[PDB]
Amino acid sequence: PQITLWQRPLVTIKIGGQLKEALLDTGADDTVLEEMNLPGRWKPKMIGGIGGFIKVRQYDQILIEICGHKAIGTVLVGPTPVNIIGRNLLTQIGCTLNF
Amino acid sequence: PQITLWQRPLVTIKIGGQLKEALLDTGADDTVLEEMNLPGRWKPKMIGGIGGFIKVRQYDQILIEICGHKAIGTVLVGPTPVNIIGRNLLTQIGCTLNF
Ligand SMILES: COC(=O)N[C@H](C(=O)NCCC[C@@H]1CNCCO1)C(c1ccccc1)c1ccccc1
Ligand SMILES: [Cl-]
Ligand SMILES: [Cl-]
Numbered sequence: 001p002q003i004t005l006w007q008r009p010l011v012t013i014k015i016g017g018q019l020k021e022a023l024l025d026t027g028a029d030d031t032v033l034e035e036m037n038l039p040g041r042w043k044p045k046m047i048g049g050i051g052g053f054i055k056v057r058q059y060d061q062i063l064i065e066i067c068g069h070k071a072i073g074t075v076l077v078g079p080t081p082v083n084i085i086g087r088n089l090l091t092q093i094g095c096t097l098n099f
Numbered sequence: 100p101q102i103t104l105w106q107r108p109l110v111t112i113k114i115g116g117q118l119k120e121a122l123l124d125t126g127a128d129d130t131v132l133e134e135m136n137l138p139g140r141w142k143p144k145m146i147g148g149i150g151g152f153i154k155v156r157q158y159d160q161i162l163i164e165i166c167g168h169k170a171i172g173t174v175l176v177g178p179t180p181v182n183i184i185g186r187n188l189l190t191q192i193g194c195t196l197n198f
């Protein structure tokens with residue numbers, strides 16, 4: 001699809017048996033989701049943006065479905081104010097910026 | 100042009116006659132640049148990021164060129180980790196997300 005930027009680019013995602021709303025974010029290196037349970041081992045990480053840093057749990061090889069496209073990658077879980085789909089998963093669905 | 104997301108979508112911008120590097124960020128409602136001098140009056144604005152909120156200076160009707168595309172709009176100045184081109188200016192240059 002072609003997603004305009006007149007509004008925030010929010011999409012429905014499917015992850016760990018849950019349906020969540022998330023923002024397609026080209027400015028984010030990583031995918032960051034609000035607190036939720038995920039399977040497997042995890043490692044702590046600090047991620048920073050505007051306002052400073054937050055502590056998150058890093059889960060690897062997580063299956064996530066975005067607009068019918070199945071993608072696998074690292075998902076960060078923590079106290080983010082908005083669910084973000086970062087470049088690590090956008091590349092997997094073939095997402096590009098065009099102008 | 101078409102920009103893939105395997106690397107950060109950093110582009111050259113021109114503002115106040117000077118070249119700077121900025122990130123095309125579909126996850127940002129607004130354009131936020133590192134400390135610099137801009138003409139005229141400014142208004143206060145609070146913007147929220149992954150780590151919390153920051154105070155910035157809002158300047159309106161500012162000429163800014165992005166990849167050679169001329170835009171005139173709102174530019175925020177403050178303590179950002181990187182210069183960010185947000186949706187307010189991405190819409191002016193006809194930028195969309197595609198997959
Ligand atoms: C070590 O890598 C980083 O620290 N990466 C930062 C990152 O990906 N942060 C995740 C949230 C970004 C989202 C972006 N959209 C709004 C919600 O916040 C990243 C950064 C890039 C270039 C230079 C320094 C920083 C960035 C980018 C934008 C704003 C703030 C920070
Ligand atoms: Cl990944
Ligand atoms: Cl590709």
Ligand SMILES: [Cl-]
Pocket residue numbers: 171172173187188
């Ligand atoms: Cl604007």
